[PDB]
Amino acid sequence: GPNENYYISPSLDTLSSYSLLQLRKVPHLVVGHKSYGKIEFLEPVDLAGIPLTSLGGVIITFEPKTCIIYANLPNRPKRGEGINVRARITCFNCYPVDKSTRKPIKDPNHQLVKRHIERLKKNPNSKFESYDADSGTYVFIVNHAAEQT
DSSP: OOOSSOBOSSOHHHHHTSOHHHHHSOOSEEEEOTTSOEEEEOSOOOOSSOOHHHHOSSSOEEOSSSEEOSSSOOOOOSSSOOOOOOEEEEESOOOOOBTTTTBOOOSTTOSSHHHHHHHHHHOTTSEEEEEOTTTOOEEEEOOOOSOOO
16 A cells, blocks of 8 residues: 555545445444554444534544544544444554664664563553564554443
């Protein structure tokens, strides 16, 4: 996908061309900007017209290091249907160099990569998926759709 821009399941406009059920029943959700990072959602989107614009405008934002939802939207479904965040997020440039020595690290050296992974395990707020040393890419799943209250 050497696409300069980002593609969707199968695009903002392409999605609109969806049938009545298809629009409200989004099978596979795929959103990625290649360079920014590949993000895939296993959740659905039932709106029967995509009225996201009313809620915001961009409908979807992705920082080239961090993922951005609608706006800290804890899946607040006051009225209508909402999409869960039960998906995997992938971010590039995991290696944020070493500030201690300012050692520009851009290789699979993994000098302190192990330390970062250990911290993730302690964090019981997100589910660790799989970490690739060769690509240094970090993928994890944080589904907060379900609330205990």
